[PDB]
Design a binder for this molecule. Structure first.
Ligand SMILES: CSc1ncc(Cl)c(Nc2ccc3c(c2)CC(=O)N3)n1
Ligand SMILES: CSc1ncc(Cl)c(Nc2ccc3c(c2)CC(=O)N3)n1
Ligand SMILES: [Cl-]
Ligand SMILES: [Cl-]
Ligand SMILES: [Cl-]
Ligand SMILES: [Cl-]
Lengths: 123, 4, 123, 4
């Protein structure tokens, strides 16, 4: 018999992104080919199968720095980190291959799906 | 607010 | 020129609630008249003007235990904590006064608004 | 996915 507030989830995500932009309560640095990205472990886990596995590990859950595979493109990661905190994906002809490869590595199934569809339309 |  | 995934914010909140239910990466205990509630500081801040003020304070941001005012009803808090992580509010004739008072103290403006409207309809 |  609950009532539901339609905009609640969007408002929560908007506030989490405001915290990220002001570097409030960020608890991890993600290192991508020397580029560094500060974030909230819980948000990373909520969006990515890879981060979910990493931060549920009894040893890795305590790390303040995570280094990604050197094949990962920092721009592709940045676009995906922005998507995690906003639901918006900056998908362009020039970045789609790097975004898809990064989403496959991060295990972000819905992003991989839209990249496959956009690539298939161009062939 | 809605009835979900 | 971004594309947007409609269900992303809801899916993020659903995963954050799964983490809460398994007590994964919870970093604070909220004490309400001896009852204890584990939660994520970032989610509490994203939903409540009171928690936002508390955890942006340079001293309180580091506390692992927060004690609420003794006038706060634990059931009212529990219903609001559930709403924070799900967008669903269990509003009933028997709890509406405690829920509204708790939402006013926590500074959750949209919850206060629906409680005022439901109370006005019954008079 | 939509055009926001
Ligand atoms: C599976 S239970 C669960 N519980 C809590 C969290 Cl934080 C979580 N995250 C997560 C797991 C897998 C995947 C994603 C998020 C995005 C994706 O494409 N795959 N999962
Ligand atoms: C105001 S900027 C901002 N930035 C980040 C966060 Cl985490 C935040 N939360 C917050 C503040 C006030 C209120 C709420 C959340 C719910 C409500 O009714 N009032 N606010
Ligand atoms: Cl470390
Ligand atoms: Cl995704
Ligand atoms: Cl403490
Ligand atoms: Cl609210």
């Amino acid at each position: 018999s609950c009532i539901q507030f339609t905009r609640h989830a969007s408002d929560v995500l908007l506030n989490l992104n405001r915290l990220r932009s002001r570097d409030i309560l960020t608890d991890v640095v993600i290192v991508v080919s020397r580029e560094q990205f500060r974030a909230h472990k819980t948000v990373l886990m909520a969006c990515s199968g890879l981060f979910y596995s990493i931060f549920t590990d009894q040893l890795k859950c305590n790390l303040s720095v995570i280094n990604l595979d050197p094949e990962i493109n920092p721009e592709g990661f940045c676009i995906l980190l922005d998507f995690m905190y906003t639901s918006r994906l900056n998908l362009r002809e020039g970045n789609i291959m790097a975004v898809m490869a990064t989403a496959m590595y991060l295990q972000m199934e819905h992003v991989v799906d839209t990249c496959r569809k956009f690539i298939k339309a161009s062939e | 607010w809605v009835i979900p």
